[PDB]
């Protein structure tokens, strides 16, 4: 397992430090 339930485990922006405020359901900074 990552950090996220709105981002696919292996994304660009959260691979070594997490970026998302809402964190468990939908995000508006990896689109
Ligand atoms: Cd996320
Ligand atoms: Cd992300
Ligand atoms: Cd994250
Ligand atoms: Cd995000």
Redesign the pocket.
């Known amino acids: 397992k990552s950090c996220?339930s709105c981002?696919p485990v292996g994304?660009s922006?959260?691979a070594q430090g997490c970026?998302?405020k809402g964190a468990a359901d939908k995000?508006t900074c990896?689109a």
């Open positions: 996220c981002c994304c922006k959260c970026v998302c995000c990896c």
